[model samples]
Target: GSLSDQLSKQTLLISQLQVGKNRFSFKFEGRVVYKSSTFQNQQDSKYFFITAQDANNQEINLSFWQKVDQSYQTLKVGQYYYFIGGEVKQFKNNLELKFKFGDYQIIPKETLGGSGGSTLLISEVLKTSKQYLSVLAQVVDIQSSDKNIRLKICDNSCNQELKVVIFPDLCYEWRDKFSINKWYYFNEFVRQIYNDEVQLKNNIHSSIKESDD
Candidate 1:
């Protein structure tokens, strides 16, 4: 009753750029920001993950499982490109595009409206199985126990809190950068399920800056 009550598949294809939501498929292109090292799953299939920035600078997550090795090597973070879009899925809570192949374009920043991409609200973000999300949130609580600092992003936990973790190795380096009660723009962090709960950690390649409010 939740999905498909309304008719239309094409209507959902461009969901990334739309103000609405979807449960079908989509097509997207963006600049690579975070690329995961290739690895094997329980099925013994090799695959990799990449988080790219769409035209709005909103994070578009991609997972590559094709058998091509050389072509994959040509892919690099920080470069702009498109892909042969595939099945769109709702992993955790955020919307993601799956692809294996497109064209590369050096998009000028000025060409875009430069609205600073899509700034997800704390209420909008969901638990993702992998990394790749951009959000505008404020620090509600913080704790540095041992090797990590657990920073809660939402003051109002409708159901749960989105945990932004800083590893002991780099938490100290970012301590001065993150201020409690301050709003910020964060992208390219790794989100995974830890101990049956959703958790996020810095990827070292994250682009975290103060929100321009």
Candidate 2:
């Protein structure tokens, strides 16, 4: 039994991939670096792009497309998954891996060591304009309204402080956990653009914890 498992190894490093269809039917796993909003093509197919980093920290591009069904768990930034089966293709000299939804396995949380995402500085978060991402910074200010709690956070690279809000529903748990001047790691939060400025907000996939580092 274990012999078959040992011989069935099919995963490859991101650095070892070629430009066209790979020779062996290899599957890959990586940490989600970036995820794009879904777009529809002329043929009515839905698709999105993802940037992921393999164990060696080398980055690769992945594309997922489907026809009309949306029956898959949307991949969140800062999460880890084993992409089950996909093919690598080069578009305009950039390697792009193609797969569909429901063909992935989320890496279990218990096996994760650190926050599993593309950790960014405050300045880089603002510059990238990415809608979903992670950040590690200090809790510089705290203000609470009856409805929600607002926090101002900053890191060394901050040009402007980032504002994050804990809505009323989630406030009960976080109300007493954070304090000013302490570092925190904010993961998988939504980056919203309002009047040309970016603000952090909690989405279904968001989480916050005191920084362990």
Candidate 3:
């Protein structure tokens, strides 16, 4: 079946089938909300997951296996992209699609026939003392053993508690940097409790320096 048809169909037969058996194709344009590379098991292999929202505001998860070359590099949140390939499968009661031997490219929306809307900058939104219409706050205390830092975060905004995990490589950079009684903002569009850990969705360019004053 064509990729478009397969994606449009709601149900996918997941009976005992070979990995490379079914071939489906489709093209979708959306802004990447989250992207992460993590080890599936203790083994040392990595997997990449990219979640994007379509025009209808629906979210889709695209999985790439054993391939993390330049094709998947520089995937920033709020950046628009077009994805082609793979088939959908049921994963943990939710539909997750996989792209094997598939390829993708990131294109600026304006170049791809878009109005060139401005990307949302996290600093501009959070720094405002006036509460945004969608912002919420819930109190939750969390501690990080790796960083030896603890604080209470406003989880009500998106039901996410602020916490940092310091691995060997990045430990030194975070030492004495994170502080208590400081408000950190997490983008709700990318914060999902049931999914992977909370991620800051703002892109590198979207992060602005906060004034100490």
Flag regions of model 3 displaced more than 4 Å: 1-24, 38-44, 102-213
Shift of residue 185 alpha carbon in model 1, Å: 1.0
- Model 3, 1-213: lDDT tens per residue? 443443463322223222443433344566788987654764645578888776667777777764554345546667876554555566675666676663433344433432222223333334332221122222255454563433334442343453322233233333455555444432222222224433322222221121243
Q: Assess every candidate by TM-score.
A: 0.40, 0.46, 0.37
Top candidate when judged by lDDT against the true structure: 2
User: After best superposition, candidate 2 residue 195: deviation in angstroms?
Assistant: 3.4
lDDT (Cα, tens digit) per residue for candidate 1, span 12-89: 223444424332333345678898888876565677777877655578666766643433554567775534334565
Q: Estimate the lDDT of model 1.
A: 0.57
Ranking the candidates on lDDT from highest down gives 2, 1, 3
Runs in model 2 lying further than 4 Å from the true structure:
1-116
